[PDB]
Amino acid sequence: PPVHPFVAPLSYLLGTWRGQGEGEYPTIPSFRYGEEIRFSHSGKPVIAYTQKTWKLESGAPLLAESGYFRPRPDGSIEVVIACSTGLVEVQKGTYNVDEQSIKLKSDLVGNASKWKEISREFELVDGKLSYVVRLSTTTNPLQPLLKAILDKL
Amino acid sequence: PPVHPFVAPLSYLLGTWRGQGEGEYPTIPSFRYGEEIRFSHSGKPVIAYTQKTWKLESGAPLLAESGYFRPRPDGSIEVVIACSTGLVEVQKGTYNVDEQSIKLKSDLVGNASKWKEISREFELVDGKLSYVVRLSTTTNPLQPLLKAILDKL
């Protein structure tokens, strides 16, 4: 399967990333986690995304997500994600081929009444995949929650 | 690892299913598709679901979806799904251990303005997994869209 021309600008994502991150939020005291993310494709104008996080010290599973990245040649992109916690997300924004970055704001957060906005920003930095996830809640404004850096395998 | 007691009632699902199905809807002329579904778990109170469909005759990929089945011992169950078409779904309902059936109605259909409600009912019949997906849209009431029957591999 060749990479679809719609997906070609993001082909640096494709493969298996592994690394580690940190969470902290006003409500949640800080923590570290292992993370693995696989981007794959089947020759269509879509990238499939799957992800898992585990306890850094125990290797005991925490969360999983899966979804689909849908980029379009005008630089816009939508991402739909389902989480093992029972949450769904519609994410929208842009990608920049120069910066090899992707900036997303939730258009919808579903099945999580307390969580308002979620943004996710990816960025290839030094050949490693980085992201910041931000969360806003009923009571707390939008602010970082998760930061990670992963090596491509 | 080993089956969480919450997932235990649904352990028949676990594995890879392969079969075919049919789509028809007032707007859409009838079509057939090949379909593969994989239910798996990592010992948590959740079943991961991934699915793909392809053209019966050509073998060309059509859609894919992924998400999570979350059953609870009160017989209730919640399913979240992300689709390669950029849709998300929150499904809610019940499973019946006697009938080996699962009946879900969407609590939310996300990023698909014309589609209002999607119901999904599964049933193990004769060792085969079979389902009906129902759709209502802005102008059409709820009615079958997809019917499939899969063999466990």
Curated annotation (Swiss-Prot), chains A, B:
User: What pathway does this protein act in?
Assistant: Nitrogen metabolism
Catalytic function, reaction form: peroxynitrite = nitrate
Q: What does this protein do?
A: Heme-binding protein able to scavenge peroxynitrite and to protect free L-tyrosine against peroxynitrite-mediated nitration, by acting as a peroxynitrite isomerase that converts peroxynitrite to nitrate. Therefore, this protein likely plays a role in peroxynitrite sensing and in the detoxification of reactive nitrogen and oxygen species (RNS and ROS, respectively). Is able to bind nitric oxide (NO) in vitro, but may act as a sensor of peroxynitrite levels in vivo.
- Alphabetical keyword list: Cytoplasm, Heme, Iron, Isomerase, Metal-binding
Which GO terms of the molecular function aspect are on file?
A: isomerase activity; metal ion binding
How is this protein named in the record?
A: Peroxynitrite isomerase Rv2717c
Q: Which PANTHER family match?
A: PEROXYNITRITE ISOMERASE THAP4, THAP4 PROTEIN
Q: What is this enzyme's EC?
A: 5.99.-.-
Q: Which domain of life is it from?
A: Eukaryota
Q: Which family does it belong to?
A: Belongs to the nitrobindin family.
